[PDB]
Amino acid sequence: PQITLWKRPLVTIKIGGQLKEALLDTGADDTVLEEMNLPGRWKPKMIGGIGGFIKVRQYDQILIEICGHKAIGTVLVGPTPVNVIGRNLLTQIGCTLNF
């Protein structure tokens, strides 16, 4: 679809078999989801945002469907203010900016 930006670009995602709402965030290199249970192994990592750095759990090679489009990639889980879909997955679903 073509998404205008008068509202937040929020979409429904499926991860670990569960539906959630997430923000399509072209300013995020990485995908960061709020605290949740995910199966598989993970590794502790640090990511920095506008206000500093937080601790996250890095899950690699996770299946995630974004607005009906499948991706498989890295998902960081931690105290982000909102679920964000970053460029690592936006590229997989073929997302571009256009003006």
Next chain:
Amino acid sequence: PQITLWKRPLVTIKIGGQLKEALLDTGADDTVLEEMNLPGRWKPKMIGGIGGFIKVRQYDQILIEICGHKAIGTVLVGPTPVNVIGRNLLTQIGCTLNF
């Protein structure tokens, strides 16, 4: 134009008679720019993201040119690690997400 997301979507902007580089950021409600000494009045504000909040100065009705597209709106100035063009201005240049 069409911008892919393999790399950060950085573009040149013109603001306050200065040229700078900023991200086209669909996850940013507002526009947040590096410290610069703009003229005129301003209101204090706090904006939150990964890692917490930063304190910024809110300037209204600021003229900004983004890839030769003109806009006018609110700009927040403060110790942000990256210049971000937010939805308040992206809507004005006709920017959409597409997949």
